[PDB]
């Protein structure tokens, strides 16, 4: 019933993108904590790294 301009669509897409990026960075950073207080050993290993 009420469409949106392409610029508004791209701003909304930017909002989604930045939110998922911060969620991903939180998800990856908690891995250090769980590895640490689960075994004290930690393996920062990944492809292209």
């Amino acid at each position: 019933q009420n469409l949106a301009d392409p610029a508004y669509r791209r701003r909304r897409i930017i909002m989604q993108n930045m939110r998922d990026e911060e969620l991903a960075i939180a998800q990856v950073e908690e891995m250090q904590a769980v590895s640490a207080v689960l075994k004290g050993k930690y393996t920062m290993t990944g492809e292209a790294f």
Partner: protein, 49 residues
């Protein structure tokens, strides 16, 4: 995740978001009734003599 990409080889990105729909058109109900003034002659169970 974007686990541990070294800061030279950033590489690939991820899909943004999206996708779902649904359609259920109106529902409807119309419980009519009637009067028939002829029935108004004899009284109801209430309305004492």
């Amino acid at each position: 995740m974007a686990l541990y990409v070294s800061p030279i080889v950033s590489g690939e990105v991820i899909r943004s978001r999206g996708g779902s729909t649904s359609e259920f058109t109106p529902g409807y109900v119309k419980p009519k009734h009637e009067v028939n003034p002829q029935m108004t002659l004899r009284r109801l169970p209430d309305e004492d003599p």
